[PDB]
From Swiss-Prot:
This is Ferredoxin-1. Transmembrane segments: none annotated. [4Fe-4S] cluster binds at residues 11, 14, 17, 54. Ferredoxins are iron-sulfur proteins that transfer electrons in a wide variety of metabolic reactions. Residues 2-30 form the 4Fe-4S ferredoxin-type domain. The gene is fd1. The lineage of its organism: Bacteria, Pseudomonadati, Thermodesulfobacteriota, Desulfovibrionia, Desulfovibrionales. It comes from Desulfocurvibacter africanus (Desulfovibrio africanus).
Length: 64
């Protein structure tokens, strides 16, 4: 159906998204950045709001 995720590649180090989704997004030591590991940790309204909170928006939904 509809998916999504991020590329901690363009993630500076702010928890802006992590807050709008302290369950799906969360920076790590391997990616020393926030990564959408748990898509269920953030609802579309939450995961989304957090995505709009990012400065560069290093996140992208995955349809396929
Ligand atoms: S909102 Fe954007 S810059 Fe801040 S941790 Fe999440 S991915 Fe990183």
């Amino acid at each position: 159906a509809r998916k999504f995720y991020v590329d901690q590649d363009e993630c500076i180090a702010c928890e802006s998204c992590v807050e709008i989704a302290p369950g799906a997004f969360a920076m790590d030591p391997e990616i020393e950045k926030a990564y959408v590991k748990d898509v269920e940790g953030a609802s579309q309204e939450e995961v989304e709001e957090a995505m709009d909170t990012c400065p560069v928006q290093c996140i992208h939904w995955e349809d396929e």
